[PDB]
Amino acid sequence: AVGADAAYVFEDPFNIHDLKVNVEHMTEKMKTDIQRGLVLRNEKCHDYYTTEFLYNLYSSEGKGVFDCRTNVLGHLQQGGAPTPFDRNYGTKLGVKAMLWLSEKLREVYRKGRVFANAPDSACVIGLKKKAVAFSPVTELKKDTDFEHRMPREQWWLSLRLMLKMLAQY
Amino acid sequence: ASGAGKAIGVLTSGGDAQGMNAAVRAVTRMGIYVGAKVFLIYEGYEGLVEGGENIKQANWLSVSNIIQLGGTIIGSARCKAFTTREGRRAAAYNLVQHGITNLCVIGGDGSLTGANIFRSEWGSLLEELVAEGKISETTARTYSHLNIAGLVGSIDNDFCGTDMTIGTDSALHRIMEVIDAITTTAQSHQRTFVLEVMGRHCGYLALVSALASGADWLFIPEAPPEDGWENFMCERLGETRSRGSRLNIIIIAEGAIDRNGKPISSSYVKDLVVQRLGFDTRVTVLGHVQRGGTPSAFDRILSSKMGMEAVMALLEATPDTPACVVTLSGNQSVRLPLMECVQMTKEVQKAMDDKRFDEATQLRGGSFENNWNIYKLLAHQKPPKEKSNFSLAILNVGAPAAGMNAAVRSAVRTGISHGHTVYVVHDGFEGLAKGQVQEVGWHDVAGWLGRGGSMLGTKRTLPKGQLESIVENIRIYGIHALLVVGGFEAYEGVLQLVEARGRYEELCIVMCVIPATISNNVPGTDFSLGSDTAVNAAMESCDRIKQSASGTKRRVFIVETMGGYCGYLATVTGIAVGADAAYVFEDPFNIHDLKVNVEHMTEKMKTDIQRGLVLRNEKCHDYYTTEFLYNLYSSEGKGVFDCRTNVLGHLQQGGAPTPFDRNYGTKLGVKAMLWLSEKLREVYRKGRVFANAPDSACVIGLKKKAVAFSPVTELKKDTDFEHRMPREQWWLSLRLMLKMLAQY
Amino acid sequence: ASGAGKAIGVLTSGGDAQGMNAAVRAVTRMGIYVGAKVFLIYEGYEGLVEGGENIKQANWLSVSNIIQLGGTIIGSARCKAFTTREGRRAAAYNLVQHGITNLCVIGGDGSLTGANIFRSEWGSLLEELVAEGKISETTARTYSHLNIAGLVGSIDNDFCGTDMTIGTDSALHRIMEVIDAITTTAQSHQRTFVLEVMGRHCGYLALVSALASGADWLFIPEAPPEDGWENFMCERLGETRSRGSRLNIIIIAEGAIDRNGKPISSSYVKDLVVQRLGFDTRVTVLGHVQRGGTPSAFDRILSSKMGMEAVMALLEATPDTPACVVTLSGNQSVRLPLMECVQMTKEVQKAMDDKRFDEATQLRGGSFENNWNIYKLLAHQKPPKEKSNFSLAILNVGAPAAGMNAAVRSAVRTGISHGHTVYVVHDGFEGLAKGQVQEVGWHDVAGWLGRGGSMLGTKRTLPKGQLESIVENIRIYGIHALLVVGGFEAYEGVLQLVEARGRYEELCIVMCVIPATISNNVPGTDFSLGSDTAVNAAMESCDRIKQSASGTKRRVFIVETMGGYCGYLATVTGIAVGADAAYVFEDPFNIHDLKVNVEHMTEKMKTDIQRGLVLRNEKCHDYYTTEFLYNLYSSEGKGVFDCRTNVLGHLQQGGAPTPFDRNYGTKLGVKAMLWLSEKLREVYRKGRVFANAPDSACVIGLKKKAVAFSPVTELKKDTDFEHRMPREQWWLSLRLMLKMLAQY
Ligand SMILES: CC(=O)Nc1ccc2c(c1)OCc1cc(-c3ccccc3C#CCCCO)nn1C2
Ligand SMILES: CC(=O)Nc1ccc2c(c1)OCc1cc(-c3ccccc3C#CCCCO)nn1C2
Ligand SMILES: Nc1ncnc2c1ncn2[C@@H]1O[C@H](COP(=O)(O)OP(=O)(O)O)[C@@H](O)[C@H]1O
Ligand SMILES: Nc1ncnc2c1ncn2[C@@H]1O[C@H](COP(=O)(O)OP(=O)(O)O)[C@@H](O)[C@H]1O
Ligand SMILES: O=P(O)(O)OC[C@H]1O[C@](O)(COP(=O)(O)O)[C@@H](O)[C@@H]1O
Ligand SMILES: O=P(O)(O)OC[C@H]1O[C@](O)(COP(=O)(O)O)[C@@H](O)[C@@H]1O
Ligand SMILES: O=P(O)(O)OC[C@H]1O[C@](O)(CO)[C@@H](O)[C@@H]1O
Ligand SMILES: O=P(O)(O)OC[C@H]1O[C@](O)(CO)[C@@H](O)[C@@H]1O
């Protein structure tokens, strides 16, 4: 969305070879009319290559061609008012979820039982493809990495190729 | 580049010296770096005459974890069989069996003479081995010459071509550890101690440790006491202890003789003191403790430079070259004929037996004579009756450096005996601004020689911000000379006063800087006072960190060190501990060099020696901090090593000074005060401001073989003020040695 | 609270001991803290009989910068005049002139007897001074009683009511420094050394330093050698040196006698070895080096606890209380009658002269007997011919701690002589997973006693993540017992195997933990192996930092220390250097406490002692890091002091172990292996899995006066696993002492 020259992300391996390559690309750009750079870092993209590590690296190997600065966007990214998509989507999930909650809550009966013991009764709603899916919370364990708190395959990893192509790799 | 295809043997022989490990390590690593095959020849010449399992080939690891060990890991047995030609021919056979053609000998004058002989007849030993058919003529035409390089390993300093034999500074660390012990129990009880030290026929250890400890009397075989001396000793022991002292230390060399050449015992000295002064008195025959313990930083660094030169001296020698000994001649190594140095040493033993004690003194060396003349000065000094016109002031400026207190003591005493009203000023130039100036007596400075830190106190404050008040205390106390002992702010401080002589009539004052700092960054000198304590205090700490890394296998340590912008302390410490890199401002480095140093660190973890150490100077790089190196090594080493950081801080200022900082501080304090008093009569009482010339404001320092006095304004062109250091520094050649011993 | 209005005198007397300064400092600071007037009584009893200028009142600063100094700053002259009633009456007069009513004596059994007498007739000396009219009756009714507290200062450990006299650990540091020297020169040349040590009539220094150095023979006057011993010595010196060794060390006490009570000289031992073995042999009469140098951490901390108790013992004493001596009885101090302890000491000299050498041994103490029995064990041990069924394995786990190598050596040797196939496993439980297991012989472990680090290698890895592979190497090598030497991961490691005996048939195996860590955080023991090296390595570094701060006047240092969540290492180091605070997890602290500690640090900069030191444990606080304290002190101190940070890291793991870590590691390695072998026959060959009971998986440790073996599962309730430490820790009472000596 901003045409950043790299985005450092945990789902990609990177090391000082990749960083030194991204810095010599950043150097070669300063010969052009567009004498600026932006690299994004995810807050946990790397265990030892922190934002201060990248600052030191770029500042050094760029000395005599560019200087360098750090910003940490924090709780700014939680935003102010929601976008039109988060207002539609939040409204639409709040109703589709409540229609499912009320449907399932009559699919279980008043007499001689504990209600709803089945794994079919504890779900996550979400936009999956063209429209919503309801996925059982226990069925999702195998799609989940709990140590990194995220799903094991994520649709958007194809967009990293687009980022690199628009960034002149 | 490599340049060999040939074999080097190495043996350590005769009396062992702590430092022989750092020597055999550097002979091994330089030998196999330059592409030779190195053989360790176990148990001196006794394993040269046996051969067999006593001669086995080294690899880079065969000399690992030895640089911090005393004695010698190959061992140094005596061999009367090699003193016979029947052993000496078998010693030739064992070398030419393994194909060994070059031989490094680490030892004293006897063990080096045996090597000199073993060349002088080599071809005739080879001829006899052909004549009896043990070896073929082609081999005797191949191995037709032996190259010897001598490394002079000895605690005595008994060898006349050299300022320091390998071991003699560490033996002084052992003696000064024992006197730093005995001073506390002698002071509490008010006792006299007779200390006996291992000067066999050479008084170096006795003189140098007497001068470094403030010993009240000394017995060296090159300067025996003149007739009736028992009176003059009982007067000298009386005088100091009447002059407010409490203990006395008496140093006796084991080899000590009277003026007739007949031996004087430590027992006879003890009996004499008891019977003629009634003082409670003890005798410590300090023994082979002197031969042992870890080598000092100077003996590791020296044995490394000596051991590297000895390998070069072998591989570049020729059959029409005389055999060589590698030696100091001041600041750097020189190479000398073995024949000449043996004979010039035998000529001293002969002069001493011939009762020519003044020839024995002069011929030991200029380094023996300057120590002896400064002991003979301070042994003759007193508070005078006469008194003199001049007022002197002594400042400490910078961070406190070990040996400042020695230099102040020696300047206060030389200043008092030259008749001056000496003042000491607390807190440096902020002291001279704030009027923290006090007149000092002979008593007031007693027992300062062995203390770390600064008894005056010291500051970084430069004088220009207070100068109108500094000139006013110079006027009020009537001060005619400043002696400033301290770092770069002492130098720039005295410079800010010479740059201000045109502005103020009172800065026409005689000025001397004694360069006292941890960092070795003061211009003029090649050694600053306290920098030997600093490399020893850092070297002791990196040994602890390496032993930590070696137990916690697959650690790499990043260790930060207090050099300022000056890479001396990181460089000499890195040699003294065999660090795998030392990052220094005077070298460019970047992530390519760092990634290279990390892939070298990775490849080492396949070996048995699964540890690393890299030193970082505190200002070596603007952005690659110690945390940057930690992150880099931790990352590119993940799966092969983990990594940790230590910052050595004010630990490196040390505790008590080394023997070198006690001698050097004492010697600069007197040479500076003799110059201060000389210059202060080279300017006259009438119709003038005194001393306006640039010739009157100087830095003292060891420059080559001996001192130079360099004008503070003349030094501006040799100085970088932005980085606070000189523009060319002698020790940058040692970075090559560091990298070679680190397996680049 | 204060509770005095009365005067305490203090004198140090007889043979000086490094530690007497830390004693007189703590007697002064506790005395004037509790509101008494303290007088320093210069030059022992000689200044008590002179009085005048020899008796002058202290203030808090009169004992500043002495805790790191050896000897005694007040001095300790002998006084035959006080052995006469004509001096003893003048000693009473000089005290009652200054009004001194309580008297602390720091000294040995003679100097304490003189104090016992000087009470026993005090009122009659006061009566004579009234009878001749020097003082009025009202004064003799006021000063009508003298209170004595005895502090036993001596290097010999000659005193029978006590485990350590003040000075005896520092004298062992002096001896072990000299043997760490002599081992390197004796090893290179293959020489035997006769070492003579200052055990006057007491063999403690000789036995303890023989056991700590691996000495091949020993001569103590409480256990003289039986007739014809020259054969058995020449066999023992032959055996070890035939069994792949190289040097020998022979320790002789200066006081050594034969079985007839006639003295044996170090010269007679040297002559005997030369004439009956033909070994090259030397004699070092290691002298008053033993009395000197800086006190060890144990002698500073001990002299502080002893000195604090001695002031209490004075002010709470009564005229119907017998005079007191303050002493160890294991982990903590006890107070004993002076009469009884003098007589029980005279009864040993009498038993030794009466040729009752077994009474002399038993009556020196249980601490003398356990050292002697373990020397007598290791002196009798051999590789056996018979061999036995069992396989044992030895692990190192955690960070490497000094004394691990001593404990492994002693366990490998005790395990070999008990007939077992001992294995050593490299890299701890990751080693036992990766099959890094090897059978070890008597040769393979030789010379490990003096090494720092770990010769096995050690890791933090807990066994559960590899357990299916750990059981499989236990099966494949047939291993029937584990000895694990290490920190909290050794404890939780052996616990993760007992918690898994129900899951795997192979973890029915006999298990012992020797607690080896820097941190003192293993449950069970009150002392972990390596924690004495750690407090000494930190105490040496904080002395350098304080001397740096004292030259650079108006510094305050923040120093960080490796305690884990356990405040032991920061607490005992803070006492050993007189730190102005130590921040520790086991104390709550916040910005109110920090601001209080900073305004105390500000008020001190008005005094002559313009320096500060605060210690921080590395995990003492979650948010108040060392940089937080740096910022806070720098700010609220701006205009009165500046401030600096050091992080002591892996420096605190030390170099070579202390004498205590060499004795303790050796002693735990044998007591653990004797228990391992006892328990391993308390389980039977037929129809069973061996050793399933919780009684078979234990931690050894010094608990009170002697060892306890505590089940690993029984210890869960004494353990906090989240902070990795025990829930109550004996040393939290020492934090009160730290704060009192720091001027709270
Ligand atoms: C008793 C006594 O004088 N000991 C003594 C101790 C230390 C020094 C002494 C003398 O002298 C000269 C010299 C040459 C080199 C030298 C020469 C070439 C290459 C390296 C070095 C070096 C060094 C660092 C050692 C201490 O920073 N180092 N040093 C320093
Ligand atoms: C030769 C020999 O055994 N030396 C030796 C050395 C060190 C120790 C020794 C014995 O024993 C017991 C003990 C008691 C206290 C003790 C008791 C009360 C209060 C404080 C302490 C302490 C401490 C810390 C010292 C080293 O961490 N400390 N120590 C430790
Ligand atoms: N004239 C000589 N010829 C041959 N070898 C000699 C001669 N002098 C000494 N050596 C050898 O030197 C060895 C060691 O010398 P030594 O005097 O023991 O120690 P240092 O090296 O200190 O003089 C002796 O074992 C002997 O082999
Ligand atoms: N029986 C005694 N009566 C009085 N004073 C004594 C007696 N025995 C010893 N002393 C005193 O103790 C002092 C020191 O004792 P000493 O034996 O010298 O050292 P230590 O304290 O090691 O025994 C002596 O100077 C003497 O004053
Ligand atoms: O390098 P300089 O300026 O001579 O100062 C020497 C001292 O200063 C230091 O850089 C530290 O200075 P501070 O004590 O002011 O922090 C050390 O390198 C050294 O001990
Ligand atoms: O407190 P523990 O876990 O027993 O470990 C002791 C060692 O660990 C340390 O906290 C450091 O651990 P590392 O070597 O892994 O960094 C030190 O306190 C000490 O040397
Ligand atoms: O140590 P030994 O064999 O008595 O040799 C004595 C001489 O050897 C030296 O140790 C070293 O050359 C001398 O200091 C000492 O006087
Ligand atoms: O040191 P001096 O006065 O010979 O006293 C000897 C005795 O005194 C002690 O130093 C201490 O009590 C003993 O170790 C030594 O044997």
The alpha carbon of C298 and the centre of ligand 2 are apart by a number of angstroms equal to 5
The residues near C516 (Cβ < 8 Å, ≥ 6 apart) are: C396, C398, C401, C403, C404, C407, C485, C486, C487, C490, C528, C529, C530, C665
> Nearest residue on chain A to B592, judged by CA atoms?
A20
Helices (H), B143-228: 168-189, 204-213
Residue C95 contacts residue C9 (beta carbons within 8 Å): yes
Cα of B287 vs its chain's centroid, Å: 22
Q: Are C579 and C735 in contact (CB under 8 A)?
A: no
User: What kind and span of H or E run contains B710?
Assistant: strand B707-711
Nearest CA residue ID for atom 8, ligand 3: B110
B vs C: CB pairs below 8 A: 212
Burial B675-690 (b: 16+ CB within 10 A, else e): bbbebbeebeeeeeeb
H or E stretch covering B198: none
Q: How many residues does chain B have?
A: 744
Closest CA to B98 of B152, B153, B60, B42: B42
Coil, strand, or helix at residue B12?
Answer: strand
C458/B551 touch (CB, cutoff 8 Å), yes or no: yes
Resolution in Å equals: 2.9
Q: Which residues of C touch B76 (CB under 8 A)?
A: 188-189
Rounded Cα gap, residues B528 and B523, in angstroms: 9
Q: Which residues contact B161 (CB under 8 A, 6 or more apart)?
A: B152, B325, B327, B336, B340, B341, B344, B345
Helix, strand, coil percent content, chain A, rounded in steps of 5: 40, 10, 45
Cα–Cα distance for residue pair B600/B743, rounded to 1 Å:
8
Dist CA C472 CA C433 (whole Å): 8
First CA to last CA across chain C, in angstroms? 11
Q: Identify whether the C-beta of residue B64 lies closer than 8 Å to the C-beta of residue B609.
A: yes
> How far apart (Å, rounded) are the C-alpha atoms in residues B107 and B19?
11
With a 6 A CB cut-off, is B298 part of the ligand 1 pocket? yes
Buried residues in C120-157 as b, exposed as e (16+ CB within 10 A)? ebbeebbeebeeeeebeeebbeebebbbbbbbbbbbbb
- A147 in the Ramachandran plot: left (φ > 0), alpha (ψ -120 to 50) or beta? alpha
Residue B642's Cα: distance from chain center in Å? 36
B209-219 burial by CB neighbour count: b if 16+ within 10 A, else e?
bbbbbbbbbbb
**Nearest in space to C363 (alpha carbons), one of C158, C530, C566, C561:** C158
- The best mutation among B302, B372, B528, B540 to test binding of ligand 1, ranked by most ligand atoms within 8 Å of the C-beta, falls on B302
Which amino acid, one-letter code, is at C64? S
- Alpha carbons B123 and B138: distance in angstroms, whole number: 13
- Other Cβ atoms within 10 Å of B153 Cβ, number: 32
CB C613 within 8 Å of CB C577: yes
Between CA C452 and CA B294 the distance in angstroms is 14
DSSP state string for C387-445: --S-EEEEEEESS--TTHHHHHHHHHHHHHHTT-EEEEETTHHHHHHTT-EEE--TGGG
Contacts of A56 (CB under 8 A, 6+ apart): B623, B624, B625, B628
- Assess whether C156 carries a catalytic annotation: yes
Tell which atom from ligand 2 comes closest to the C-alpha of C531: 27
Q: How many helices (H) and strands (E) does chain A have?
A: 4, 6
Instruction: Tell me the backbone φ, ψ of residue B480, rounded to 5 degrees.
Output: -105, -15
d(CA C417, CA C414): 5
3-state secondary structure of B456: coil
Which residue of C lies nearest to B20 if distances are taken between CA atoms?
Answer: C188
Closest CA to B289 of B389, B209, B189, B346: B209
* Partners of B253 in beta bridges: B197
Question: How many angstroms from the chain centroid is the CA of residue B705?
Answer: 13
Distance (Å) of CA B607 to CA B64, B268, B601, B615, C714? 11, 58, 11, 21, 43
Q: Answer whether B393 contacts ligand 7 (Cβ < 6 A).
A: no
Q: What is the rounded distance in angstroms from the CA atom of residue A6 to the CA atom of residue A44?
A: 15
Neighbours of chain A (3+ CB pairs under 8 A): B
C-alpha–C-alpha distance, residues B519 and B572, integer Å: 11
Give the list of residues 6+ apart from residue B91 with CB closer than 8 angstroms, or none: B45, B48, B49, B82, B118
- Give the phi and the psi of residue C393 in degrees, each rounded to 5: -125, 140
Query: Residue C250: is it exposed, middle or buried by C-beta count within 10 angstroms (0-12/13-18/19+)?
Result: buried
Cα–Cα distance measured from residue B493 to residue B470, given in angstroms and rounded to the nearest whole number: 12
Q: What is the 3-state secondary structure (H, E, C) of C199-267?
A: CCCCCHHHHHHHHHHCCCEEECCCCCCCCCHHHHHHHHHHHHHHCCCCCEEEEEECCCECCCCCECCHH
Hey, what amino acid is at C477? Y
Distance B177 CA to ligand 1 centre (A): 19
For A130, list phi and psi in degrees, rounded to 5: -80, -30
Phi, psi torsion values for C356, nearest 5 degrees: -85, 60
CB atoms inside a 10 Å sphere around CB B70: 29
Distance separating the N- and C-terminal Cα atoms of chain A = 17
CA distance C190 to B43: 10
Taking the CA atoms of A110, A112, A114 and A120 in sequence, report the sign of the dihedral they define.
Answer: negative
Which residues 393-412 in chain B show a CB within 8 A of chain C? 396, 399-400, 404
The residue type found at B75 is G
Whose tokens are 């699919």? That residue is: A107
Write the CB contacts of C73 (distance below 8 Å, at least 6 apart in sequence). Answer: B188, C21, C24, C63, C66
**Exposure class string for B181-196: b at 16+ Cβ within 10 A, else e:** bbbbbbbbbbbbbbbb
**Helices then strands, each counted (H, E), chain B:** 24, 24
Token readout for B628 is 């940057």
What tokens does B734 get?
């040692």
Q: Report residue C577 as tokens.
A: 């250097």
> What does residue B48 show for φ and ψ, rounded to 5 degrees?
-75, -40
Q: ∠ at Cα C606 (C601, C611), nearest 5°? A: 50
Q: Which of C598, C540, C699, C22 is nearest to C303 (CA)?
A: C22
Residues with CB under 6 A from ligand 4: C 13-15, 45, 78-79, 82-83, 107-111, 113-114, 117, 154
Using CA atoms, how far apart are residues C257 and C260, in angstroms rounded to an integer?
8
Q: Are C506 and C702 in contact (CB under 8 A)?
A: no
d(CA C516, CA C514): 6
The overall longest dimension of chain B from CA atoms, in Å, is 93
A168 labelled ligand-binding: no
Q: How far is the CA of C229 from the centre of ligand 8 (A)?
A: 28
CA-nearest residue for atom 28, ligand 2, is: C298
C20 CA → ligand 4 middle, Å? 17
Evaluate whether B485 touches B396 at the Cβ level (below 8 Å).
yes
Least Cα distance to C689 among C504, C441, C514 occurs for C504
The CA radius of gyration of chain B, in Å to the nearest whole number, is 27
Structure tokens that stand for C307 in this block: 């000195």
CA distance A11 to A111: 50
Residues in chain C: 744
Q: Which residue, by CA, sits nearest to atom 9 of ligand 8?
A: C15
Other beta carbons within 10 Å of C539: 25
Element of type H or E holding C11: strand C7-12
H helix or E strand, kind and range, residue B373: helix B366-380
User: DSSP letters of C100-119?
Assistant: --EEEEEE-HHHHHHHHHHH
Q: Nearest CA to CA, how far is B642 from chain A (Å)?
A: 12
**Ligand 7 pocket member B156 (CB < 6 A):** yes
How much of chain B is in helix, strand and coil states, percent to nearest 5?
A: 45, 15, 35
Backbone φ, ψ for residue B443 (5° rounding): -65, -40
Alpha-carbon distance of B337 to B335, in angstroms, equals: 7
Alpha-carbon dihedral sign for residues B659, B664, B670, B673: negative
Return d(Cα B490, Cα B524) in angstroms, integer: 12
- Which residues lie closer than 8 Å to B84 by C-beta, 6 or more apart? none
Q: By C-alpha distance, which of C624, C614, C650, C563 is closest to C744?
A: C614
Let me know: does B88 contact B46? Beta carbons within 8 Å. no
Determine how many CB atoms are found less than 10 A away from the CB of residue C607. Answer: 13
Q: Would you say B576 and B535 are in contact if contact means Cβ atoms under 8 Å apart?
A: yes
Query: Which residues, including other chains, have CB under 8 Å from residue B322's CB and lie 6 or more apart?
Result: B337, B338, B339
Structure tokens at C122: 């005090």
Chains B and C touch (3+ CB pairs under 8 A): yes
C137: Cα separation from own chain's centroid: 48
Max distance between CA atoms of chain A, in angstroms, equals 80
CB B151 within 8 A of CB B310: yes
10 Å CB burial of residue B94 (0-12, 13-18, 19+) is buried
- The pair phi, psi for residue B728, each rounded to 5°, is -130, 135
Paired tokens of C569: 């290492």
Tell which residue, B493, B429, B533, has the closest CA to residue B724.
B493
